[PDB]
C-alpha cells in the first residue's frame with residue numbers, strides 16, 4: 162500500500178533536461194511508494210509562453226496557499242531563447258518572479274558524501290549559502306540609451322519632495338539600470354541568516370561592497386550589524402560562534418582559503434554566483450540543495466543548477482546522457498519531508514529521509530554519473546547514464562527501506 | 563653606477579601595510595640600482611583627505627601626461643574609516659576615480675611558481691582576469707529612501723523625448739541605485755580582451771547575467787559577439803582558440819572545474835570579485851599582477867589586493883608581520899619594464915625582468931612569507947617576516963644580476 166498524503170505539494174514543471182529527469186524521478190522513485198498528491202503547474206517555457214507567464218504567477222500564489230512548492234529548473238529567456246522558441250516576449254525569470262512574490266532567503270548547501278573529494282584542497286566541511294531571495298538586479302529596470310542625453314535616478318516622496326541625481330551625461334549610445342531593495346526585506350534576510358547559522362551551529366559570514374556602494378550595500382552592512390548587536394550577539398557568544406563581515410572580494414578569497422563549515426550570506430546576485438562556485442567546487446552543480454524560505458514561513462524546494470541545456474541538446478542528437486539527478490531528487494524529498502512535518506505524516510518524513518540516504522549511499526558505493534566520476538576515492542567505480550543512476554538509487558533504497 | 567631613467571613614472575603612495583611595504587621595496591630593491599625618477603602623488607588616506615581628493619585627480623591626469631603609473635593599495639572609506647580617520651567625507655574609491663578617468667581594462671593574472679600548488683585541484687595553468695575598468699557600480703548613484711513614495715529610472719534625450727520607468731513603490735524605508743555604462747567603453751573593453759587573449763594565445767571566456775539583466779548585461783553580450791564575429795573570429799580560428807560565452811554563474815562553475823589557462827573577461831564588479839577568487843585559489847592575494855591599460859594606451863600598475871589592514875593593526879600592536887610583497891614588487895617592475903620599453907632603456911627592462919625572476923626564484927627555493935608556507939612542495943622551507951622576504955629576494959637577485 163502506497164504512502165498517503167494530506168495537503169498537496171505545489172509542483173512546478175520545468176524545461177529541457179530537468180523536465181525529462183523530473184518525470185523519471187516521479188515515476189521510479191516517488192509514485193511507486195507515495196500516492197502523490199500535488200497541484201500541477203507547468204512552468205515549462207512553452208506553457209509559460211502560451212499563458213503569457215500567468216502560470217508562474219498562479220504557482221506562486223498556490224505556494225502561499227498550501228505552503229510548500231517543489232520546482233524544476235526552467236529556462237529564463239534571452240534574445241537566443243526568444244528565437245529558439247519563437248516567444249511572444251523575453252519573459253522574466255520565473256524564479257525571479259516566484260522569489261519576488263514570496264520574499265525570503267534561498268539556502269543552498271552541498272550534498273556531501275565521504276568518498277567525494279572537493280576540488281578545493283582543505284574544504285573539510287560544507288559551506289552553505291544563504292542568498293537573499295528578493296530585489297536588487299532581479300527586479301531591475303534597464304534602458305538602452307540611443308544617443309545623447311541625461312540619465313537620472315529620481316525619487317518622489319508620498320508628500321511632495323523630489324530628489325534627482327544624475328546617473329550620467331551620454332553623448333553616445335550605452336546602457337542604464339536602476340534597482341532597489343527595502344529595509345523590511347533586508348531585515349528578514351538578516352534574521353533568516355542568523356537563525357539559520359544557529360540552527361546549524363556555525364559562524365555566519367556576510368559581505369558586500371560597502372566601500373563602493375556607500376548607501377545601498379552599506380545599508381545591508383548596517384542592518385546585519387544592528388540585528389546582530391541586539392538580537393543575536395547574545396545567542397551567538399553563547400554557542401561560541403562568531404559573526405563575520407568583510408568585503409565581498411575579501412570574502413571569496415577567505416572562503417577559498419578556509420576549511421568550509423560556515424554559512425555564507427550573500428545578496429541576491431552574489432548568492433547566485435557563489436552558490437555555483439561552491440557547488441562546483443564541492444563537486445558538481447548537481448550536488449547541492451536549494452530551498453527558498455519566505456519570512457512568512459512558506460517553502461519552495463528546487464535544484465540550484467539550471468536545465469542542463471547542453472546535455473539536453475546531446476540527448477536530442479540521440480546520444481545517451483549522464484545527467485546527475487541528485488539535486489532534483491533532493492528537492493522532491495526536501496519538499497516531501499516538509500509536507501510530512503507540517504501534516505504529521507511520519508511515514509512521509511522517514512520516506513524522504515531514507516530516500517536521501519539511499520541516494521548518497523549509492524554514490525558512496527561507487528555508482529554515480531560522469532560529473533562525479535573523477536572526484537571519487539572509490540576504487541571500483543560504476544559510471545552510469547541518467548536512467549541507470551536512478552535505477553541504482555532505487556535498488557539501494559528498496560534494500561534498506 | 564645606478565641605472566638612469568628618462569620619462570618619469572607617476573608614483574601614487576598608499577595606506578597602512580602596503581604603504582610600509584612600498585617604502586621597503588623602493589629602498590632595498592629599487593633605489594640601490596636605479597636613480598628612481600618619479601613624480602610623487604600621495605594617495606594615502608590622510609593626504610587624500612587634506613586635499614579633498616584633488617591629489618587623486620592630479621595623479622590620474624599625470625598618468626595621462628606621462629603614460630605609466632604605479633600605485634600602492636589605498637583605503638577606500640566607509641562609515642568605519644570616516645570614524646577611524648575623522649574624514650571630512652566618505653571619499654570615493656581612488657581606484658574607481660583613476661579608472662573612470664582612464665577607462666580601460668584591468669588585467670590580472672597569478673604569479674606562478676613551480677613549487678606552489680593551487681588550492682583548486684587541477685588548476686594546471688594560470689587563469690587571467692580581464693576586468694572592465696569602467697562604470698557600472700563603480701560609478702553608481704544611490705539613495706536611501708526614508709519612507710513611502712516613488713523611485714523612477716529616467717532618461718531625457720538631447721532632443722525632447724523623456725522616458726520614465728518605475729523602479730519601485732515604497733511604502734517603507736529601503737534603498738535605490740542607478741548606474742550606467744557606454745557602448746564606446748564596452749567596445750574598448752571587448753577589443754582589449756580579444757587582443758589580450760591573442761597576445762596570450764588562449765581562449766577568451768566572457769560571461770554575464772544576460773537572462774536577468776536583459777538590456778544592460780545583454781548589451782555586453784551582444785557587443786562581444788559582434789566584435790568577435792567580424793573582427794576576431796578570423797584570427798581566433800586561425801590560432802585554434804575559441805571564444806566562449808556563458809552565464810556568470812555557469813562560468814564560475816566551469817572555471818573551478820577547468821585546468822585554467824584561459825583569459826576570463828568580467829564586467830567591473832565581477833572582475834573585482836573574481837580576481838580575488840582566482841588569486842586566493844592560486845595561492846595568495848599577493849601572488850597576482852594587475853595593470854590597467856587604457857584604450858588610449860596609458861598604464862597604471864598596482865597590487866590586486868588591498869592594504870592588508872589586519873596585518874597593519876598587528877604591526878601597530880608591535881607584532882612582527884609576514885606580509886607578502888610579491889604583488890607590489892611586480893607592480894613596480896611591471897611599471898619599470900614598460901617605462902623602459904617606451905623610452906628604449908634596455909637596462910631598465912632587463913633589470914625589471916631579472917628582479918621578477920629573482921623574486922619567483924626566491925620562493926622556488928623555499929623562502930617565502932606565511933601566506934605561502936602551506937602551499938609549498940619545497941621540503942626545506944624558510945618562512946620569513948616582511949623585511950626578511952625582501953632581503954632574501956635581494957640576495958637571490960644580486961647573485962644573478
Ligand SMILES: NC(=O)c1ccc[n+]([C@@H]2O[C@H](COP(=O)([O-])OP(=O)(O)OC[C@H]3O[C@@H](n4cnc5c(N)ncnc54)[C@H](OP(=O)(O)O)[C@@H]3O)[C@@H](O)[C@H]2O)c1
Pocket residue numbers: 233234235236237238256445446447463464465466467468469470471472483484485486487488530532773808809812815
Ligand atoms: N531554474 C533555475 O534555478 C536555473 C538555474 C540556472 C540556470 N537556469 C536556466 O538554465 C539554462 C541553462 O543554464 P546553464 O547552462 O548556465 O546552467 P546549468 O543548467 O546549471 O548547466 C551548467 C553545466 O553544469 C553542469 N551541470 C549542471 N547540472 C548538472 C547535473 N544535474 N548533472 C550533471 N552536470 C550538471 C553541466 O556541465 P557540462 O555540460 O560541463 O557537463 C551543465 O552544462 C539557462 O537558460 C538558464 O536560464 C535556470
Ligand SMILES: NC(=O)c1ccc[n+]([C@@H]2O[C@H](COP(=O)([O-])OP(=O)(O)OC[C@H]3O[C@@H](n4cnc5c(N)ncnc54)[C@H](OP(=O)(O)O)[C@@H]3O)[C@@H](O)[C@H]2O)c1
Pocket residue numbers: 372407408411414634635636637638639657846847848864865866867868869870871872873884885886887888889931933
Ligand atoms: N587599492 C586597492 O586595489 C584595494 C583593493 C582591495 C581593498 N582595498 C582597501 O584595502 C582595505 C582592506 O581591504 P581587505 O582587508 O578586504 O583586503 P586586503 O588588503 O587584500 O587583505 C585581505 C586579506 O588577504 C590576505 N592578504 C592580502 N594581501 C596580502 C599580502 N600582500 N600578503 C599576505 N597576505 C595578504 C590577508 O589575509 P590574512 O589577514 O588572512 O593573513 C589580508 O588580511 C580596505 O579598506 C579596502 O578599501 C584597496
Ligand SMILES: [Mg+2]
Pocket residue numbers: 433434437465466811
Ligand atoms: Mg544560478
Ligand SMILES: [Mg+2]
Pocket residue numbers: 410834835838866867
Ligand atoms: Mg578587489
